Design a binder for this molecule. Structure first.
Ligand SMILES: CCC(O)(CC)c1ccc2cc(-c3[nH]nc4cc(C(F)F)sc34)[nH]c2c1
Length: 238
């Protein structure tokens, strides 16, 4: 449920393009209001996505205040994340990141993903653009209630979605983080021969090794998010 009346929302500024607006709920809480795009996706699927997210509680997954149903265009009322999407934040702050901070960002995403994996929730669109940056550079996974660059071989050829296909996307997300927001890469068939993604300068041999483990051809050969989490934590300690 969590239905919010339109009169309770104050629209301040468009911050993303459906559209994302910086706003206020009850003239108190700073919120990110996501208004539906009239063309893409139905009103019903947009609300169902929010209903799924409101029942998934983890410190590394974005939270919602509620939904605005009354009039078109309908909107989702999210908590406001101070530094916006991860993809943009990595590019704007490029050259100012230490390798330890970039690994910490990957650990944050992996934590949220391990929770979703255990809850049997498949993201389907895991990328740096679908992750948010809050205070103290904390990363939260967004749009988890629902390309080829982030798609695994079984996804771009047979549409076989699983937590192991999300693991492949996480490997590409890891590349985006360590390359500081670089755009990855008929991208399918290029990956079929053996073309991965070049090793980023800030990523160590041990970090790139984990990325390759996410990029195994067979989904059963890729490690689960629960295993990846402890593998990433081992590198940070040593
Ligand atoms: C980069 C900082 C800023 O330019 C400040 C206005 C910015 C830009 C875009 C966003 C998007 C958010 C945001 N917070 N929470 C959500 C949820 C979103 C999704 F679920 F629609 S986008 C978003 N904060 C921002 C902050």
């Amino acid at each position: 449920g969590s239905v919010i009346d339109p009169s309770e929302l104050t629209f301040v500024q468009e911050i993303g393009s459906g559209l994302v607006h910086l706003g206020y709920w009850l003239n108190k809480d700073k919120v990110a209001i996501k208004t539906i795009r009239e063309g893409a996706m139905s009103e019903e699927d947009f609300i169902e996505e929010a209903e799924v997210m409101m029942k998934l509680s983890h410190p590394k997954l974005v939270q919602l205040y509620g939904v605005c149903l009354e009039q078109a265009p309908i909107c989702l009322v999210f908590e406001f994340m101070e530094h916006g999407c991860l993809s943009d934040y990595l590019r704007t702050q490029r050259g100012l990141f230490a390798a330890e901070t970039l690994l910490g960002m990957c650990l944050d995403v992996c934590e949220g993903m391990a929770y979703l994996e255990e809850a049997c929730v498949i993201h389907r669109d895991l990328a740096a653009r679908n992750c948010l940056v809050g205070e103290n550079q904390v990363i939260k996974v967004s749009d988890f209630g629902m390309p080829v660059k982030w798609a695994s071989p079984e996804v771009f050829s047979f549409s076989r979605y699983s937590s192991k296909s999300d693991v492949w996307s996480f490997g590409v997300l890891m590349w985006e983080v360590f390359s500081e927001g670089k755009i990855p890469y008929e991208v399918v068939e290029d990956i079929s021969t053996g073309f991965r993604l070049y090793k980023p300068r800030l990523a160590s041999t041990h970090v790139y090794q984990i990325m390759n483990h996410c990029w195994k051809e067979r989904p059963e050969d890729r490690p689960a998010f629960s295993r990846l989490l402890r593998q990433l934590a081992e590198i940070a300690e040593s």
